[PDB]
Design a protein around this ligand. Sequence first.
Ligand SMILES: CO[C@H]1O[C@H](CO)[C@@H](O)[C@H](O)[C@@H]1O
Ligand SMILES: [Ca+2]
Length: 133
Amino acid sequence: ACPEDWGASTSLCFKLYAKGKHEKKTWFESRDFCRALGGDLASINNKEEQQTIWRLITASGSYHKLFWLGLTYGSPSEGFTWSDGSPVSYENWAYGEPNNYQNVEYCGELKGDPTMSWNDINCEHLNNWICQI
Ligand SMILES: CO[C@H]1O[C@H](CO)[C@@H](O)[C@H](O)[C@@H]1O
Ligand SMILES: [Ca+2]
């Protein structure tokens, strides 16, 4: 059971926020937006959660879009973490990622195509985002 307009059409209550360029957000702004609603940026802990999100993407009819996930670099010994505190065990990094390109990439984004792959990118980029509750 999810709140109205969340989850499919854990309780798997993910929600896509696809936005035009004047409404996209940095990673921190997206984290704060999802947390203000009582949730967090989406963590993808297994293939079932990945399928839930992919199916929501297909229903919105817009492909290839980039979305912030809850991926954020921790300490050097931790590497990438989920903002919700869950362990990063399941991974779906794109080929060669995370690559910390130019040493400035400390947040993770989802490429909303069938591969559902993750890429590290600069946290101050403006992206779409996905929340969970
Ligand atoms: C040029 O940088 C972009 O492409 C590389 C892969 O080539 C990514 O790792 C990086 O995060 C950027 O999206
Ligand atoms: Ca990268």
